[PDB]
Amino acid sequence: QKTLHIYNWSDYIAPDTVANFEKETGIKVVYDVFDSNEVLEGKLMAGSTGFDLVVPSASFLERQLTAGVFQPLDKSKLPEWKNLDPELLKLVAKHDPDNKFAMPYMWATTGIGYNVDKVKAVLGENAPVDSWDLILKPENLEKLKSCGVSFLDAPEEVFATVLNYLGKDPNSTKADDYTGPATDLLLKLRPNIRYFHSSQYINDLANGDICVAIGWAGDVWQASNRAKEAKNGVNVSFSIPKEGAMAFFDVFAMPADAKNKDEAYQFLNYLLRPDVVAHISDHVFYANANKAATPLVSAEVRENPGIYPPADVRAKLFTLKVQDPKIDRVRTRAWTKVKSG
């Protein structure tokens, strides 16, 4: 009886995906979850992860490749790879040349989640919910503190977002952009932020304990759906702001020391089935990377422009680039200053 160890983001699979896979294959799955690319990167760089499959964002996977922590995927063992959208593959290939190591899973944007009724109560019916001004303008964040503000604990994403908002290159390579204007704005906003966290904001939005957050798109749409099913009167929405936003592509990868690679390939092939991955999108409110799966995705998810955004919105999205050690050091130091103080 072989097993399979999977490490994925929290709130990123359907409730029955693993159980259905177990029943069909007789494999027992050990499934654990994270909410931080930094936590996963640290595990991969410090020693064995103990997992057969892990799911980093592609921009982090680029750095992980330089350490040799993944096994190149045997495409002969992934017959339905063709189901993957070739345009998303090409974007991920910027981080993973010729798509040797990573299987695109889901993708979304880093935008603004908010409580519709509370934001209009505080900022009025003309609140700029289509703009990063809603939370990155100090005058606005000071008022929204009344009902709670959270930021992702995602340093590379938050700094890229702030740099873009400031009219800088989102992937600026000038240290002074981080230590000066980016830090200046974040510290002006810092007094109004209740916490930095990358998963507690989902239920807090759903229960009405925070009213605005920097959040991941599908996470916020999950919060909205949780509130509706609870019939608690909380109306949550998500915005991809007009100034653009970061896009991310989360990918399955196979640690080089994975014990049960054959079982791992069986699970990747299971995910490449259009019906399996469309069912996941239906429950987690994320766009998958499977072009063959799109007709099976529920209308509610597939037609949500905050999940599958239209071309004019996609044209304003940016992606993270890997920085050299100098900028990495300055960004991390600045992040700690922003959070603590």
Ligand X SMILES: COCCOC[C@@H](C)OC[C@@H](C)N
In the complex, minimum distance from the CB of residue 86 to ligand X, in angstroms, rounded to a whole number: 9
340 annotated among ligand-binding-site residues: no
153 annotated among ligand-binding-site residues: no
- The residue among 101, 332, 48, 111 whose CA lies nearest residue 241 is 111
Q: How far is CA 211 from CA 223, 320, 327, in A?
A: 12, 27, 33
172 annotated among ligand-binding-site residues: no
14-32 burial: b if 16+ Cβ within 10 Å, else e: beebbeebeeeeebebeee
Handedness of CA 36, 167, 236, 297 (dihedral sign): negative
Binding residues (CB under 6 A) for ligand X: these are 85, 87-88, 91, 247, 314, 317, 319
Which pair of tokens denotes residue 109? 């944007």
In the complex, minimum distance from the CB of residue 34 to ligand X, in angstroms, rounded to a whole number: 23
Which residue minimizes CB distance to ligand X?
Answer: 247
Name which of 31 and 318 has its Cβ closer to ligand X: 318
In the complex, minimum distance from the CB of residue 316 to ligand X, in angstroms, rounded to a whole number: 8
CB contact at 8 A, 166 and 226: no
Name which of 88 and 301 has its Cβ closer to ligand X: 88
Name which of 52 and 156 has its Cβ closer to ligand X: 156
Name which of 199 and 319 has its Cβ closer to ligand X: 319
φ and ψ of 280, to 5 deg:
-65, -50
In the complex, minimum distance from the CB of residue 88 to ligand X, in angstroms, rounded to a whole number: 5
In the complex, minimum distance from the CB of residue 160 to ligand X, in angstroms, rounded to a whole number: 13
Name which of 24 and 87 has its Cβ closer to ligand X: 87
CB contact at 8 A, 133 and 239: no
3-state secondary structure (DSSP) of residue 229: helix
In the complex, minimum distance from the CB of residue 296 to ligand X, in angstroms, rounded to a whole number: 16
CB contact at 8 A, 6 and 267: yes
Name which of 14 and 317 has its Cβ closer to ligand X: 317
Q: At what angle do helices 17-25 and 261-272 cross, to 10 degrees?
A: 120
Binding residues, by number, are: 10, 219, 250
Annotation: binding site for putrescine: 10, 219, 250
